[PDB]
Design a protein around this ligand. Structure first.
Ligand SMILES: Nc1ncnc2c1ncn2[C@@H]1O[C@H](COP(=O)(O)OP(=O)(O)NP(=O)(O)O)[C@@H](O)[C@H]1O
Ligand SMILES: Nc1ncnc2c1ncn2[C@@H]1O[C@H](COP(=O)(O)OP(=O)(O)NP(=O)(O)O)[C@@H](O)[C@H]1O
Ligand SMILES: Cn1cc(C[C@H](N)C(=O)O)c2ccccc21
Ligand SMILES: Cn1cc(C[C@H](N)C(=O)O)c2ccccc21
Ligand SMILES: [Mg+2]
Ligand SMILES: [Mg+2]
Ligand SMILES: [Mg+2]
Ligand SMILES: [Mg+2]
Lengths: 261, 261
């Protein structure tokens, strides 16, 4: 009696990437399910007995320490932002992002990105802080997305930006490289300069070197370097999850372990 | 020449609670403004040179360590939640909260509270973890509010909950008391049991002891204790801010310092 596709789907919910269990073994579904249920209950018991930390929270804290220690100021800015910030980012029809916005009320949206708020902080802090100005933010961002194993509608972005002196492509690649070697994540950098940070075919980050013409709409007139990274994609690679759902804010998975036991 | 109300409003933006400057001094507005601008620029320079941490992020990390160390599992659950969770919480017309919901699309809303997701986690984790089950979450919550010095529309909630053995009012008051003495925040506890944690006339928390009849709609049939705290209200008290805007996710204040310099 071979397993049904529905049964294999159920077992795949319970399977963790380092389990060495093969589904075709010939063992009955009920037995395979009971084995995986026992393993996942034990995984949750071990977390509860020892560390008790959530992967997404813990990763945020680790990234925060890395950037604070490298001289970047920690920002916490609004998640619910004025809708006019989207248009002011140059996002209109004929851009993909235009159709992906979660609107709230008449004049607000859930931010799909961190760039508007980081631009505003760079402009304001230039009146107080010495050159160069280095800032970062980690927090929720929102985009409407087609179903896909690499995309969430509710995700978490790291964004960092430096403005003034030292804003070279070399220095940008150095930050990225030190950061991902610190986290233990393999990558390739692929390249007004623009560049993407790839893990195989998966985009971990897009990064940039300024100035660009958009800066003037935000009151920025200095060179800059910066990048944006999705935390759930970093977790997906680090823990070898097959679907990014395992890494997201979720009621269905805790540290990549099914909560439906 | 006395200061105008508009001028005093501008100086109050620049005034920090421990400044020992009196507005009626007789000094001209321009001079008082220049003094406060210099002080606030220096405050930002000192943060940037030394700690570089945001108060709201740092408070979240401190609270996280307190609860993890006391045996509570750290949860990160969705901020964008099904609208049906609101009705299932018993929130209908004739309740205040009913009119305060930020709706998104047809079937979702920004969570105004943490209770639905914590109920769901308690039910699911009861199948895996030993008694008692202790969990907590910190993160963004959203409510439409009238203008007021104690309310934000975008705020941050701590919610903790224990289920099973040990769920007594005494144990609940002990958690609260240890927590606020750890943070250095003065309070009074004022009291199916219900109780509020007050700082003067300001509500820091509402807390509760179960079971209650609502539990059955969430699949819960064990005793419980729990509470919810606003982080920005804790910061407002700790730092003696006159308006909670100083403590919120914001583009206008950084660690209670005006960014408009
Ligand atoms: N829906 C999403 N879910 C998870 N992470 C995301 C999502 N959208 C963007 N990210 C992350 O945020 C980073 C910066 O955003 P951005 O450069 O705008 O993404 P993007 O170009 O739309 N990438 P993609 O949709 O994969 O082609 C990306 O490199 C991802 O790591
Ligand atoms: N709009 C808000 N801004 C900031 N903190 C809030 C807000 N609403 C609730 N809180 C915090 O969240 C805690 C738990 O929420 P809840 O008990 O529902 O609040 P509440 O009853 O509406 N309090 P209040 O509106 O002041 O009378 C409160 O005790 C506050 O510390
Ligand atoms: C600061 N920052 C953030 C991003 C990612 C995305 N565009 C966002 O705004 O969140 C980014 C990309 C290139 C250069 C700088 C960047
Ligand atoms: C777990 N928890 C959370 C709250 C506050 C608010 N009602 C919310 O849901 O976020 C709360 C109040 C009493 C008892 C337990 C509580
Ligand atoms: Mg995209
Ligand atoms: Mg990209
Ligand atoms: Mg209220
Ligand atoms: Mg209350």
């Amino acid at each position: 009696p071979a397993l049904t596709k529905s049964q294999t789907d159920r077992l795949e919910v319970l399977l963790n990437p380092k389990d060495e269990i093969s589904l075709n073994s010939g063992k009955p579904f009920r037995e395979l399910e009971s084995e995986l249920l026992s393993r996942r209950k034990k995984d949750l018991q071990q977390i509860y007995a020892e560390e008790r930390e959530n992967y997404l929270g813990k990763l945020e804290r680790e990234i925060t320490r890395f950037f604070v220690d490298r001289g970047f100021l920690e920002i916490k800015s609004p998640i619910l932002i004025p809708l006019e910030y989207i248009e002011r980012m140059g996002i209109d029809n004929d851009t993909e992002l235009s159709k992906q916005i979660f609107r709230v009320d008449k004049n607000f949206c859930l931010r799909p990105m961190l760039a508007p708020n980081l631009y505003n902080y760079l402009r304001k802090l230039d009146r107080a802080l010495p050159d160069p100005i280095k800032i970062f933010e980690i927090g929720p961002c929102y985009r409407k997305e087609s179903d896909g194993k690499e995309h969430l509608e509710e995700f978490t972005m790291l964004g960092f930006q430096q403005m003034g002196s030292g804003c070279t492509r070399e220095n940008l690649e150095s930050i990225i490289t030190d950061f991902l070697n610190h986290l233990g994540i393999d990558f390739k950098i692929v390249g007004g300069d623009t560049l993407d940070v790839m893990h195989g075919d998966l985009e971990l980050s897009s990064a940039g070197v300024g100035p660009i013409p958009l800066d003037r709409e935000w009151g920025i007139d200095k060179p800059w370097i910066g990048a944006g990274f999705g935390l759930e994609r970093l977790l997906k690679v680090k823990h070898d999850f097959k679907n990014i759902k395992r890494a997201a804010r979720s009621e269905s998975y805790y540290n990549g372990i099914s909560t439906n036991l």
